[PDB]
């Protein structure tokens, strides 16, 4: 994929903000897309 590892969700920010992805191991979030 695009720099992100597997381990992720497509959470939403404050509400409408963005679908910042969120990892569930490390619980960081981001704009790219993982695929392995």
UniProtKB/Swiss-Prot annotation:
Interacts with STIL. Interacts with KIF20B. Interacts with NEK6. Interacts (via WW domain) with PRKX. Interacts with BTK. Interacts (via PpiC domain) with DAPK1. Interacts with the phosphorylated form of RAF1. Interacts (via WW domain) with ATCAY; upon NGF stimulation. Interacts with PML (isoform PML-4). Interacts with BCL6. Interacts with FBXW7, disrupting FBXW7 dimerization and promoting FBXW7 autoubiquitination and degradation. Directly interacts with RBBP8/CtIP; this interaction depends upon RBBP8 phosphorylation. Peptidyl-prolyl cis/trans isomerase (PPIase) that binds to and isomerizes specific phosphorylated Ser/Thr-Pro (pSer/Thr-Pro) motifs. By inducing conformational changes in a subset of phosphorylated proteins, acts as a molecular switch in multiple cellular processes. Displays a preference for acidic residues located N-terminally to the proline bond to be isomerized. Regulates mitosis presumably by interacting with NIMA and attenuating its mitosis-promoting activity. Down-regulates kinase activity of BTK. Changing residue 20 to A: Reduced affinity for KIF20B. It comes from the Eukaryota. The WW domain is required for the interaction with STIL and KIF20B. This is Peptidyl-prolyl cis-trans isomerase NIMA-interacting 1. Expressed in immune cells in the lung (at protein level).
């Amino acid at each position: 994929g695009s720099k992100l590892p597997p381990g992720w969700e497509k959470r939403m920010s404050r509400s409408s903000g963005r679908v910042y992805y969120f990892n569930h191991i490390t619980n960081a979030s981001q704009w790219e897309r993982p695929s392995g």
